[model samples]
Target: NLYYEPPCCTGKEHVQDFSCGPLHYKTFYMDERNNALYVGAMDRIFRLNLRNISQSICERDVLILEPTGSDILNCVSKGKREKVECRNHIRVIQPMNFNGQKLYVCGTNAHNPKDYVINANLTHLPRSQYVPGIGLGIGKCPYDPADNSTAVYVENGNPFGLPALYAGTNAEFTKADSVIFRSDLYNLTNGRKEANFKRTVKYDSKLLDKPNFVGSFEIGEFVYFFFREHAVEYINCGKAVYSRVARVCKNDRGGKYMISQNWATYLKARMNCSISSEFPFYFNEIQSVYKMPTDDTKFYATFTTNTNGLIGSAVCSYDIRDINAAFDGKFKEQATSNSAWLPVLNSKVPEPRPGTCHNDTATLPDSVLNFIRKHPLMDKAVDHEFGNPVFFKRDVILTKLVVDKIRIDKLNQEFLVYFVATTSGHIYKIVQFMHYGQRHSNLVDIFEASPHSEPIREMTLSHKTGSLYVATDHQVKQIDIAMCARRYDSCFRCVSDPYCGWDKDVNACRPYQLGLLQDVANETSGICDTSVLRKKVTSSYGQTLHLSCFVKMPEVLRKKQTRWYHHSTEKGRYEVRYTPTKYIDTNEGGLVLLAVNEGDGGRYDSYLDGTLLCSY
Candidate 1:
C-alpha cells in the first residue's frame, strides 16, 4: 500500500523570508564566525544575522558605476538597447580574509569592475580607502552581469600556507580568451602587479568554447573544474555539446618562455552522462556538481538535455580515478580536414612530462611545454559510474543538486540522499536503497512552493542547523530538512525517512542527530511490532472454512454494523453475501464458507462504518 507523506518545512515557523525592496539578491556568502550572511544586490550590500534574518543587521548603499548619458547614447547609436544592455549590476561578491584584520571584497561594478578591501567589522569604506585596482576584470570576475556562467573559488593555506583565488571566466567578449587564473592575495593587495604571483592559461577556442562553469574543487595536487561545452569531436552532429571535467596541476609554474606566464599542463576529459540503451539518451548540459562528503575521490553531478526540445535530467556519479585515467590515455587526432577523429599514440610527447607539477618540471625542455600548450585534450572519455546515471527524471529540468549521507543503524549502513531543485521551482528528495546487492535510487518526497514560481538560483546545505538555504532572484528562504514528527500515525512510515527514526522511549519519531546511537536507528527492536497487524489464513479447494474478524470499538461505536470483504485472486474483490448456500453468518459476526475454490485463497478484510478494522 502507498501512503501519502506531507511535505516538510511548509509551515511559516520553519521558514525565514528576507524582503529587500527593489534590490535583487545575486549571491550569498555566509560568515560562520559572526553567524551572519552577506548578500550582494544591485547597488547595495546587506549583512543579516542568521538568528533573525527577517531584519538586517547593517545595510549599505554602495556606489554603482552607472553609464553616463553619452555612454548610453553611444550604445543606442550602435543599435543596442540602452535600458537592457547598458546598466550597472553587481554580480560577484566574495569575501576573502586579508591579514586577519580586513576582508578583501571583489565585485563587478557595472562595465568597470574593481576590488576593494573592507574592515573586518563589515563597515563601508570611503572612496579613498578603497584599494587601487584595474578596470578590466579579466581574471578577477566576469564583465557582464547577465552572463552567469563564471566561477570563483578561494583556497586558503596552499602548500606554502598562503591564500589564493582560482577563477574561470572569459577575459574577452569575443569568446577567444576563456582563461583560468590563480592569483596570490598578499601580493595583489600591495598593488605590485610584477610581484604578484599569477599564472594564467588562455585556453584554445577549439578545445573549449564559452563554457558554463558549474563548480570547482582541489584534490591533492590538482584542481578540477566542471563544465559543459560544444564537443569538437562530434563530426556527424551539427553541434552537439557534452559535459566535461578538466584538471590543472596546482604547483604548475608557467612554462619557460615558450608558453610563458601561462599554464602548460591543463588538460580536459569528457564526462559521459546518459541513459542505458542500444542508442543511449544523452544529457549534454551539466547544471551543478557537488563533491561527496568526507570523500575526495568521488563527486556527483546533475545534467540535463537541451531546453529547445526534449526535456530530461539525470544525476550521475564520477570517480577521480577514472577521470585521471582518461587524462593519461591516448589523444584523439584528426588525420585530415573534414575527417573523423581517431585515437593516435602521442609519440611526440617530450621527456620530463609536459603536464607535470612545477617541482617535477625544473629540468623540462621548452619543446615539451609548447607541445602541451597546443594539445590540451585526451582521447579517453570518463564514463559515468555503472555506465549509466544513478537517477533520471523526465519533463523537469534539474538545476542544482546537493547530497547528504545518513546512517541507518538498523541496517548499519550509510546511504546517500540527494536533494534536487528543478527549474519549475520544486525540490525533490531522493534516497538510494540497496536490495540483493544492487543499488536503486527512488524519489522519496516532493516539496513545492506553489504560486511563487521563480527558478531556484542557488542552494546551500547547512550541516550545522539541519537546514537548507535556497536563493532566488528576489527572495531568500530557509527550510528545515527533516520533519519526522509529522508522520506520527505510522511508525514504519516515519522510520522510512532518511533523516528520521522512531524513538521507542518517547513513542514518537524524532530527527537523527550526530553521535546519537539510539536516535539513528530506524526502529528500536519492537517499536514497529504493533504497526504490522495482519493475520494469515489458508483453505484448500472444496473445503469449508470459518473466517472471523473482531473489532475492539468503543462502547458508543460498537452498535455500528461491520461488513466483510472477499478478494479473489483472479476475479478481483467483491462483497461477501450472507446467504444460505455460499456464506452463512455465525451469531458472533463470523463467516462460514460452504465451498471454497482456488480463487478464494486471496486475502480478506473487515471494515466497520467505512473504517478498515483488520485484514487477513
Candidate 2:
C-alpha cells in the first residue's frame, strides 16, 4: 500500500488548508528562486508556482503545466543490439546556466539492443554435421577472429544479431533493446518562449553493450560524462561519435564509476595512481561524481569495486592533472598501504566558499519567534522515530532510505543531510562535515543526527534564504539551520547497527518470544464500510427469521436520531443499546426480520431525522 501525502501550505501538522489531493503524482524539483515546485504525474508534468497560490487555496495548488495534447512517451526497448536507448521516465533533471542564463534540463529518450549476429552461411550446414560452433572445428573451421563472430556460439548460444530469442530452437526475427545515452540541452537565458531552446546530444558507442552517458559536469566547452559503467567526455555541440572524446579502457568486468570534476589535483592523482582489486578503488562503476565550482580538474567520485577476490568500496577524489601524470609515468606504482581512505584536496582542486545565509525575522511566526527567544533554531534538535528494531550479526538487506536534500549553512557553516525512510514513518537529519578549504571534498559526512521521527517524503533547500523545507505524510516543517545549531549538539554516530530481533507479541526488540496465534474465531462482527453480513439467510419451512440492521458511525458524527418502525407490527417492543459515541452495541445494529418467511424476502428501511439515509 503506497499512500501519497497531501500537500500542505503552512509548515504545521496534518491539517491541509486545502481539500484536493492530486493522486498519482510525485514531487520532482523545487525552484527556490521563484518559489515554484515541479511535479510529475502519471502522464504529465506540472509546475506549481507558489506565488500564484492564494492563502485561501484549501486544496492542492493547480498545475501550472498540466497534461496537454498527448501524454509524454517515456518508454524504451530493453535488449541488446536493438536496445540502444534509455528506458522511459524523466528520471533526472538538472538546472544550469549556459552562457549566463538559467535553464531546466533532463535526460531521457534512449533505446538500445543486445549485440548478436547470426551466420547466414551456417544455416545451410546439414543438421547432423552441424557442430553449432562448439568443441573445436565446429561452426567455422579454425574460427577466424575477424569473422565478426560472437563467442556465444561456442556455448551453443545464438550469435549476435540473430533474428530470434537467444534461448533454444525456434528462431524468429526480433529486435533487442539496447541502452542509448542522450542529454537534453536547454537555453534559459531569455524570458520568452522563443528565448527558451532545447537540443539533443547523443553519446558514442559502437559495441553491443549500449554505452551510458549519465552524470555530467561542465568545464569550458566539455561536459564530462560519468556513467554507471564507463567514463566519457563530450564537447558541446557535437553530433557525430568522433566529435567527442569517448575513451573506454578495455576491461572484462567493469564496475560502477562516478565522476565529479571538482576535487583537487592531489585527489585525482591518487585515483589515477592507485591500483586495487576492490571494485570501488578501481575505474569501474561510479555511483556519483561531484565537480567543484572553483577548480575544473579536481572532482569527487563514489563507486564500488571488486578486484580479483578482494572487494573495497569507497567514495574517492580525482584530478585530471594527476591522471595525466599517471599516464605519463611521472608517478610510480605504489604498494598497498594501511592508510584510511578519506578525502584529499590539492592545488588542482577548486576552492569554493561555504554558503552564507541571512534570515528574514519578519517571516517568523509568533510561536517560532518565541522559540527563538527561548530555544532558538540555532540549538540543535534530536528527534527519533523507532520501530521494532531487528538485529543482524552479518550483512542483511535493510530497507533503503532516500535523502531528499543536503543543506549547508554558509554563515554558521553547518551541514545537514535530510533522509526519508522508504517504509517507516520517520525523517532523519544527519549532520555532516562542513567543508572549508580551497580544495575540498564534497563527500564530507561532517556530523550526523536525526531531528524528527516521521517519514519524510520530500525536502527542498532555499539557497537564497538558507531555509530548509521538509514534506512528510501529514505535515510540512521548516527549520532555520543556522539559528538552531547552538541549542543542539552535533551527532557523529553512524546509523548502521545490527539489532537482535523484535517480538510482535511483546511489542519489543528482543529474542524469541511468543508464537503466532493460528486459531480462527467463529463469532461474527458487524461490517462498517466493508461489511456483508446476513447475506444469505434462508427461511426454514415455518420458522420466523429476524434480520437486524446496524449502522456504523463516522469520525465526525452527523447523526440526527429519528424513529424506527416494524415491517407489519404497529406495536412491538424494540431492544436498543447505546455507546458513548453514536454507535449501538449488541446484534450488530441490524434490523430484526422476525418470523421471516419466503414472502419476507423484500427490503427494509431506517429513518434518521425523518430522512431515509439507508433502505434495502
Candidate 3:
C-alpha cells in the first residue's frame, strides 16, 4: 500500500516549550514588532514575551475576565454542567489599530462578549476613554463558549472612513441567526441604536447550516470566506457536509427595504478536494486554509473525511480565477417543486440574475432582490487545481495547516512545504516534488509533542523567529521550522527533503538558503548520482521492447546525453547503438526495440557522464 512507509522521527529536541499551562489556548495573535504572543484562553487573556517564553511566562495571569454569576447560572440552565464550560472563554482576540498608541481588542466574553481599547502597554483604557457599550458583540461572538467556529477580520478599506470589522458567527445557534455582519468601529461609541451595527446578512439555512468558519481574505473588490457546512444538496447522505469557499463584494450595499441592512450579494460555491477516481473519494470537512504570500490567488486548504471505518486527509490548492469561474458559470435549479437540483439553462435564468453583485441595487426592482434573498448558492462547484488534490494521506485527521515557501538560490527554484498539525498532537512536514512536469507530494518528517496524545487546536508560523507555535487544550509549544540535521542521519535522506539540502562540508543537513552553495551543489551532484541503478525489462520474441533509464534528476539528463549499449550473445561483445535503427531507437533517453528478435534478449545498459545510469 502507498500508505505504508517508514515512520518519521519524533522527539523532544524539535520543541521549544512543552508545557504552556492548562489554559485551553483557542486563539493566538503574534506581534512580530513587540516579540509578544497574545493568547486567548478560557476566562483570561495574556501575553508571552517571545524573548523569554517559558513555564514561568505561563504561570502569570495578565488580565482575567470572570463570567458573571447570572451568566454561569444561565449556562447551567441551558444544560452546560462543567464549571469551565460556563465561563467566559475568549474565542476571538484580534488586535486592531485604533489610533497611534491604543489597540482595539475584542473577544467572546462567556456568551456575553465585549470589545475594548487597550494601550500599547497591555493595559485597558478607562471607560471614559474607550468605546462605550458592548458594541457588536451579541451578534458577532458565538453564544456557546465551547464553539470554536467563528471568524473575525477588520476591513480597513470600507467606503466609510472608519474601518469595519466583518465577523462571521453563529451567535444565536441557528441558521437564521448565522450571519456575516459589518460593524463600524467609529460608531461603536454612539448610542445603542447606532452602536456600530451596520449591515447584517443571514445565510440560507439550507445553504449553510452550522458552518465552521476557518479563515477569510480580501482580494481585489471581494472578500472570500472559507468554511465547511452541511450539504443540503446531498439528500441521500444523512447530514453530509462539504467544504465551501464563499465570496461577498466589499461594495455590496443591502437591498432597498427588501433585504435592508443585509448583504445583497452573498454567493457560495462548493470546494471539491478529493482523490480522482471512477468513484471519486472526497474529504468533505475543511479544517483550515492558508493563503500563500507569494500569490494572492493561491490558497492551501486542509480537508478530512471520516466515514465507513476509514479516515483520510488531503491538502488541495485553489485558484481565485477558478473559483470565480464557478460562481459565474451557471445556476442550479430544481426540476420541480420537490425535485433534485439540476443545472438551469442560460435562457431559463430570471432577469437581473439571482446572485449578481449589481452596481446599482436602487434601480433593481423588488422582484430581483427577493429572488436573490432566497437563492444564494451557485450552480457550478469550485474544483481543485488540475481537477485533483495536491496531497492526500490516510490514517490521520489533519486539524490545522501552515505553509512556507522556500527558495533554492543555487538552483534558482522555489517549492512549498506544508507544516500540518494532526489531531494526535503530531506535526508533519510535507514537500512537493515535480518529475516530468507532474507534481508529487510526500511526507518528509514528523514532530511529536511531549504528550503525544494531546490534540492540537491551533498552529501559527512565525517567520521572524524561524519557529512554529502550537496550541493544544492545555499547553502551547514553539518548534523550530528546520530539523533536518536532528531528524535524518544520511545525506540521501536529508537532500530528499524539498526544503533542505545536504551540506558536504558540514556533513549535515540544513535549510536551503543563500550562501549555502556547497550544500546545494552536493544535493544536485552527489545525492542523486545515478551510479547505482536498478530496473527490469522483459519482452517475448518478435514483441516490442521498451527500456527506460530511470533518471532521478531530469536536469542531469538535460545537461548531458544518455547513450545506450547492448551486449549481444551472437557478437560476444558490447556495441553502442549510436544512430536510430529500423528495429531500435531512443525516445526520452529510453531505448525502444520494435519487433525485437531473439538476438535482443541480451544485457542492455544506459549511461550518462560515463556513469551507469540504468541497466536491464
* Order of the predicted models by TM-score, top scorer first: 3, 1, 2
What TM-score quantifies how close candidate 2 is to the native fold? 0.32
lDDT of 3 at 608: 63
**Consecutive 10-residue window with the lowest summed lDDT within model 1:** 514-523
Q: Per-residue CA lDDT of candidate 3, range 87-112, in tens?
A: 76666666665546455555555555
Per-model lDDT: 0.64, 0.26, 0.66
- For candidate 2, lDDT tens digit of each residue in 585-614? 223323544444544454344444443323
Using all chains and alpha carbons, the TM-scores for the candidates as numbered come to: 0.76, 0.32, 0.77
Error of 1 at 354 (Å): 2.9
Compared with the true structure, the alpha-carbon lDDT of candidate 3 equals 0.66
Tens-place lDDT per residue, model 1, 112-166, is 4455556645665655654434334556666566555444445543424445666
Which candidate wins on lDDT? 3
Best by TM-score, which number? 3
Give per-model CA RMSD: 9.1, 25.9, 10.5
Residue pairs clashing in model 3 are: 88-110
Q: What stretches of model 3 exceed 4 Å from their correct place?
A: 1-14, 18-20, 59-61, 101-104, 132-136, 173-176, 184-203, 236-239, 335-337, 348-363, 513-616
